[PDB]
Amino acid sequence: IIESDLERAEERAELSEGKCAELEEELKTVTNNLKSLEAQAEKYSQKEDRYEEEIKV
Amino acid sequence: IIESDLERAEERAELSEGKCAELEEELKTVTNNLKSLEAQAEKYSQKEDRYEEEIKV
Numbered sequence: 158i159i160e161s162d163l164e165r166a167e168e169r170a171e172l173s174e175g176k177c178a179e180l181e182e183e184l185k186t187v188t189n190n191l192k193s194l195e196a197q198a199e200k201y202s203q204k205e206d207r208y209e210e211e212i213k214v
Numbered sequence: 215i216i217e218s219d220l221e222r223a224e225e226r227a228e229l230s231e232g233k234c235a236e237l238e239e240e241l242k243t244v245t246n247n248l249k250s251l252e253a254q255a256e257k258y259s260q261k262e263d264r265y266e267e268e269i270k271v
Contacts, residue, residue, distance in 0.1 A: 159216045159217050160220075163219050163220040167223040167226075170224075173230030173234050174230045177234045180237035184237055184240055187244045187245045187248050191245075194251035194254075197251075201255050201258030201261070201262055202258050204258075209265060211265070
């Protein structure tokens, strides 16, 4: 029973690890897309500041 | 040995579950921050355009 539970526990370690890896890829995907959006926000903010500066000019 | 392996396999499932939850929370946090930044990048883009209009004005 315990060995069956072990195979299942190992399977669950693998499924949860699997899901962690999936989340790591999804997380990196959104983190990297966030870096893109953050960078876009940054660029848009840099341009926004350039435009604010242009407004100031 | 098998119980110990079960306990550690379950521990791994729990550690992985722990990490999973952290990654899941981070996936949502980052995705939500991404969405915030999708919206902000757009708001800043809009500021680029609103600012271009103020510049034009």
